[PDB]
Design a protein around this ligand. Sequence first.
Ligand SMILES: [K+]
Ligand SMILES: [Mg+2]
Ligand SMILES: [Mg+2]
Lengths: 66, 85, 97, 163, 131
Amino acid sequence: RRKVDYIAANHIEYIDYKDTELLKRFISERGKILPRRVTGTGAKNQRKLTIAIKRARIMGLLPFVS
Amino acid sequence: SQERKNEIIKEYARHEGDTGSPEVQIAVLTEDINQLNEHARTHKKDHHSYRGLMKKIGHRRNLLAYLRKTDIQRYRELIQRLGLR
Amino acid sequence: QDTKYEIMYIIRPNIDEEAKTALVERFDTILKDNGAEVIESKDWEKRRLAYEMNGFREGIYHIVNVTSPSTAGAINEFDRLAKINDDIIRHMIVKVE
Amino acid sequence: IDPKHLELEDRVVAINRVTKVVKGGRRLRFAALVVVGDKNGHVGFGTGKAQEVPEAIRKAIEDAKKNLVEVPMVGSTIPHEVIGVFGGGRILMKPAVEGSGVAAGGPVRAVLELAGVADITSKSLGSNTPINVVRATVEGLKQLKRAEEVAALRGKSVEEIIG
Amino acid sequence: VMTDPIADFLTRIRNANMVKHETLEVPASKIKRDIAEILKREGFIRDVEYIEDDKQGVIRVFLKYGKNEERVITNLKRISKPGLRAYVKADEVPKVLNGLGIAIISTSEGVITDKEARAKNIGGEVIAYVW
RNA sequence: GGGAGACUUGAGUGCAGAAGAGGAGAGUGGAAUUCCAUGUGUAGCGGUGAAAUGCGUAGAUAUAUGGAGGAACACCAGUGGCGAAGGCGGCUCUCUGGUCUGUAACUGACGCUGAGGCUCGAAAGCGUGGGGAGCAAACAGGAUUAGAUACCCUGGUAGUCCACGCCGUAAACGAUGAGUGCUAAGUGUUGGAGGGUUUCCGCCCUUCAGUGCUGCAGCAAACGCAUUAAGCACUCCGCCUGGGGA
Ligand SMILES: [K+]
Ligand SMILES: [Mg+2]
Ligand SMILES: [Mg+2]
């Protein structure tokens, strides 16, 4: 279905791993990253989100599990 | 690098507009090839980069063949400037 | 060309402001020794971590925005020294446009 | 395209005894290929099947009458060389001189004798299946042309084309 | 690349003829112009026109059909491939389909038909049959 | 074809942008297993079609807190991406390659193919030295079986891993050489560009480069292929001439 990206709608870019406020909504319980087909992001932005989230995880901003 | 390539064009070219020419291309490729040979001596395992090196080398050789066909004087002047065999 | 480098690192939660400030100034001074110009140094937050990164479940984050060549060994020096130092928990570097 | 008002006479190419298999052994049927024509240009072929030779022959004749085609002729010869292909059967047919007779050994000889081509040079290059060689034959005879037709297409005159 | 623009021209004609398109456009050369004019004046084509553009003169063709359906051209074929070039003498001039087609030849006189060649008693390079 | 030229569409350079498990080097990580230590607690745990070998009362399994060590990177992750292929998925940095889009400034046919040569090249395997958590040929024992030199189970060596040097084989497969052009359409999708709208987002139209499915013509022995051809064509290279022996 035609769905909208948060990022595109918000006109946000240069996704920093610090942005927990934006990254935490693309995460399901126990830290798993929501699929693109669930959320509705583009491939480029989705990959940037993956990298930012993994950075946040290693930097303690977000958990790997739980 | 862009600044080095600018310098090389301005040096070896017939005009400041003549960005494209065999002598210009070869002069750029020779510096690139020297950098890549040093990179290979430091990164002996990067065969994926050695491939692009060999491709650049073949490009240079074909340009030099075109020069030997068309203008032997231009060819010899070029090689005296560059240091190739 | 000089490339921009965001640098985060996690100060322990129970350090004193005196030694902490001298420590941030140490790392900035060492970046400047190796030739990497620091344009900004700022504490981000103090937070409850996601887990026990060095036993301390809590941390204090600092950010160091830097401009420097990629050939300069400033980042490698900061890296080795933060590894050796047992006060800061993590560091991390980010090449930025 | 009508067998009506024509003296079509027939000729059997082959009867291939052909089997289906059942729990109770083998169900043996006869399949026939027949070619029929009027020796004026109009010729066709048909496939028949039945538990009897004459029944399959009748069916094949009745199917051949419903699939006729007309071949051009030039003094009991075709106008020009042609290659006919149909799935494994390549046949080339050349215009021959008069009195040289036919050059084939069946089924092509049957097809062309029934169509009325008394003098021709032919050859089966590929397979030997009578069905597909006959089909490539009719395909080539369909590829063939008439000078009047080609000249009316091109606009040029007949003499203006042959030179 | 285009190691054989003559055969590319012939095959483009064949393809458009099979889909029953109406016209064509081709990066042209003088030999293509000659062949197109021969086809024009021999009856395998309705019309042909030229276009002058800086890189290379385009030539456009307008094909021919006896009806909406029937084709005038059936198929073409180059013989000088060029991997094996076909030069022939005034006696070895081919006769495409006993005169119902045409062979296209280049000679000292120029680009001509088998008619004119076998009449003048010349030969040359054969470059295309047309069934 | 030879020679003297001239041109820019092909090929390439330059400007500006885009993407990316592309590659090599360095370090770092959380999860899980295994082991070790500390406590709790005590008779079974494990395994099977059945059992049994084994481990366990000397404290097992399990449970909770740490530590050591190796290997691989859950979600994201997809007939998705890159690479000539093999192949490449954690994270960051150093160095580096190829590709795509426009641009129409520049060279002005400089290109393609390419024997013979050179290089790369899954896994196994070899040499030297490290290392070795788990897995696991060989092997041991238990079982099964008429037998079982096997499938099952419990263990377990080389090996799997690192660095270098060798090997140079594969169902190394899209079982489809490379290059160029032409030839209905439909639909998704990746990276772009342009335009017409839209408060932006977004939607729409066009276009390039890939990546899938359906399908017309045509091709095909058939299966099937079909703008990522197995269609129409052209250049070059490699290869086949019944099966076995081999
Ligand atoms: K070894
Ligand atoms: Mg190996
Ligand atoms: Mg299909």
